[PDB]
Ligand binder design. Structure first.
Ligand code: NA
Ligand code: NA
Lengths: 573, 578
């Protein structure tokens, strides 16, 4: 018998569960007392897919709202201690995540190299210094990659910037947040913004990547795109809306607006914030891609990823300029994005990746973004009928997430998805399919998980359905639990907190950093109905083991925004 | 009862203990060491009573010596029905588990953003000139000011700050050079951090040759208030005495710049990825210029105009490194002059033979909350260059006497935790031995936990392994170094690991004000009682919420991490020492 909990703890007013894996009822013990304060029943749950973890029971101790330290006991099996606190993850983890970013800033010989990096295929060198190393084992810097697969592009460095700026605005009205924390957060954000400036060519487009073929050599760093697990470079480095650039424009436009917030006047300053420079870059990049986008896409065709990224761009540009043309632009993108919601024989209201819905949208970094982008758009849409129609597509999208998550036995509340392999049919699953358009790529989904936590909390201020809001709060707390150690490996994936933190290749000097988040758990390597983390047969194989333990900056950025949204909503019952 | 252990664990070879806190009245007489994986006891051990400690009032304690355990794995201690937490026995343990995190800690504390923007044009106190002193690291988890040193008005308390970080990193980089199991990417990270620091040292040098003592904001976190200055007292009154004498960081800064200039001698330097060349000549010329300028001016920069032990250990480092980097006889003559001065600081009185004196007649003993291992470490550096047989033997006699003194004073009284003791004197008190520095001292306010001091004495105990010729002393120094290491990592009466991110009960500083401790960093730590100097305290109830006092315990400060990083690197070098 093992009692699994969130290794850190539970938000004071959140949904609260533990999972017993055993082949009784449960006590909740006050640590300070040593004595039982609740006695609760075990709800039986079936076996999960082919995870082969035995039967499980959940214990629901949501009603506990007393701040303290507690333990769960069943029989003579005790969980580890965990904490219940208001603002628990804000209080215990938010600072560490900023230090993680500052520790990952491109610096020393790499920063020196990146002042004079060549454009692939040419001898022209450009100054693209700044930003962050992408991963605990990769000093390359990315807008996105996997572009040659079309449907898999993750938003990388730009997403970190937009997430931090958006977190900063959310915290603006929080009295218990200190101005020094604002100084640190906006610094990391504008540091990122400054790199997004340097990644823009005079023509207006942004570079996709500064890539060294994973060599760690300064001489191999080049502005390029790249494809396959062999990292073959190409000259197709102009970033289309889905290849990072839409989110970069969105982040730049948000950055230009900081002087709208009272804290920006109050905190210490030096120089002035280059506000107009950010805004002009965002506008220029935007009108450039409305001219050039399709020519930058590998298959020449826009898909749901373009549409949510361009929606964020045009929305932020509208908030930052109040120019009617950007509201028209946002309406245009929102209409397209809403039309990706489609129904078939398996699901009502799933998200389509392509035009006919034959390829469902699923995304290991950012599955919450279609709904997130719609919520952002809802903050600006004053047309009552457009707002109403959008609310309903947004409600169906939230319902679809809950519904597919609950379709099958799922004691952990792992957010399920609708996927398709290249030689396979559409099907619901826990984890992304391994046979996809990249021909190799799949890994833990912590960023995707945190993007869905972010969507669930954002919905609290957006929708009207109190029942759905309720189920979202619960969904959000269990996805949070998974990342923080309530999973079958009893493993906290936020480094420096909880137990069993995994490492990457510290024997080779590629160690995971405190405050960072790793890729995480996948299906099995041979059995895609299985579950795995550093499975025995691949654990020592360097061509494969990065799928599990390596850290990657989008995980940390989406976790940062997730916990900031949790903090906003921490008292909404 | 409670079983206290190193929260992380024990280096595979050498001294290992746990401490039991239990009633005087304990019927039990043995401990078992349990293998976590199987639950089998693999060793059974006697309990040795240690007796009460000073006026700590922690009750009775017993030590459990499981040094004989060499077998890698996870274990716990059991006494009766009481068990300790689990811990690891591993070769290279702290290197494997903490080194990378301490480097990420430094990179996380680099001066950046608006503070970097301010420091490119910071005013010099009392003038209308401004200077570009950007770079380096924030001094503390609650202080974005940057320091060579401070407490200069107290004369005997100056701690080596930013410069010590750079010398410690460079010294660690060199020790690691012939370690096959350290990866080159680690070397890239460590030399980056060290040269980042050395670059800041260069910007801190005035064209005349002296270094600025401090870039200080009166603790305000205001960009405009930053200013090159000295300051004094707890109110931070600024002044124009910002020329750093040898003891005010400048001697260690010269040592660091001279060590930096030599990195091209190391095979790794050519091997790792390049982006142009390290500024070797620039560092060496600055070190020489700074050195000769203080040979002329030092006395004028000192608050009482008189050098003391701290000038002599810092200037011994400076001259030893300049000799190493130049091979010029000139610098070996300097180093010999400084060593002769430092050795003459060892004195005896009715309490202690061969204590260290801070002033000329030994009426004020040397004690130092950041760096008490430095007199012996400087002498060890010098022994590395001294070719003359009689000079070496005489210096070895003084060193062995100093190592014996630290072991004697630590073992003078009941001391289950092996806390390194020291010989102190309050401004209106007599010389006496103690655990913790005296609260009534020349500063009129300053005292705090001693982690950097603890790690400098760990560093001294491991450097001795390669320097001295006495096996029995080398052996008691290994034991001492291990217990010092335990204290920092949670084998203490607070059951508190003070390396943030590792172990349990990590303390914070003022996170509700946005001043959060950083993972990989080390806090000040434990002190005597606030009212009772014979007691022990860490965030005591009466002062825990008082901001004029609570910085003494939980705040992080960069000397602690930097001395911790060197201490574990010297342990790693000596890990196979049979
Ligand atoms: Na492209
Ligand atoms: Na001075």
């Amino acid at each position: 018998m093992q009692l699994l909990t969130n290794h850190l703890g539970y938000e004071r007013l959140g949904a609260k569960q533990a999972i017993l894996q055993a082949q009784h009822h449960a006590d909740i013990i006050c640590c300070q007392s040593g004595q039982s304060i609740m006695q609760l029943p075990l709800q039986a749950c079936g076996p999960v897919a082919q995870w082969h973890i035995g039967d499980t029971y959940s214990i629901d101790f949501t009603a506990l709202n007393i701040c303290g330290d507690y333990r769960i006991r069943v029989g003579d099996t005790e969980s580890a201690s965990f904490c219940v606190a208001e603002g628990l993850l804000m209080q215990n983890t938010f600072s560490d995540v900023l230090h993680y970013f500052k520790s990952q800033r491109c610096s020393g010989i790499y920063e020196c190299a990146d002042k004079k990096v060549p454009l692939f295929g040419t001898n022209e060198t450009v100054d693209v210094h700044g930003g962050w190393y992408d991963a605990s084992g990769d000093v390359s810097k990315y807008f996105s990659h996997l572009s040659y697969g079309n449907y898999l592009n993750p938003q990388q460095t730009p997403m970190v910037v937009w997430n931090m700026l958006t977190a900063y605005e959310v915290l603006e009205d929080e009295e218990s947040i200190a101005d020094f924390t604002r100084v640190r957060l906006v610094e990391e954000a504008l540091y990122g913004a400054d790199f997004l400036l340097r990644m823009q060519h005079p023509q207006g487009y942004f570079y996709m990547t500064v890539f060294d073929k994973w060599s760690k050599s300064t001489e191999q760093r080049e502005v390029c795109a790249f494809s396959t697990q062999d990292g073959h470079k190409s000259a197709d480095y102009q970033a289309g809306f889905r290849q990072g650039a839409g989110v970069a424009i969105a982040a730049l436009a948000a950055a230009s607006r900081l002087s709208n917030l009272a804290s920006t006047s109050r905190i210490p300053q030096c120089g002035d914030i280059k506000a107009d420079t950010y805004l002009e870059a965002a506008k220029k990049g935007y009108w450039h891609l409305k001219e050039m986008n399709h020519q930058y896409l590998d298959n020449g065709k826009e898909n749901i990823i373009d549409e949510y990224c361009a929606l964020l761009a045009s929305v932020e540009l509208y908030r930052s300029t109040q120019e009617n043309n950007f509201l028209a632009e946002a309406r245009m993108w929102a209409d397209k994005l809403m039309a990706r919601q489609m129904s078939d024989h398996n699901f009502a209201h799933y998200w389509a990746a392509n035009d006919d819905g034959s390829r469902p949208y699923f995304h290991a970094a950012e599955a919450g973004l279609p709904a997130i982008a719609l919520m952002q758009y809802l903050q600006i849409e004053t047309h009552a009928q457009r707002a109403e129609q959008c609310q309903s597509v947004l409600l169906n999208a939230l319902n679809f997430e809950l519904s597919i998550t609950h379709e099958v036995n799922n004691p952990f509340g792992y957010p399920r998805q609708y996927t398709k392999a290249v030689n396979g049919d559409k099907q619901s699953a826990f984890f992304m399919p391994h046979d996809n358009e990249t021909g190799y790529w799949w890994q833990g989904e912590n960023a995707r998980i945190a993007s869905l936590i972010t969507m669930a909390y954002m919905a609290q201020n957006t929708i009207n359905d109190n029942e759905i809001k309720s189920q979202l709060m619960i969904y959000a707390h269990r996805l949070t639990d998974w990342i923080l150690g309530l999973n079958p490996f009893d493993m906290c994936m936020l480094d420096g907190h909880g137990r069993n933190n995994p490492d990457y290749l510290p024997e080779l000097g590629f160690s995971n950093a405190k405050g960072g988040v790793c890729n995480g758990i996948t299906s099995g390597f041979e059995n895609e109905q299985g579950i795995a983390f550093k499975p025995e047969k691949q654990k020592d194989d360097m061509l494969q083991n990065w799928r599990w333990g390596e850290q990657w900056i989008p995980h940390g950025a989406w976790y940062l925004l997730a916990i900031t949204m949790q903090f906003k909503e921490r008292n909404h019952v």
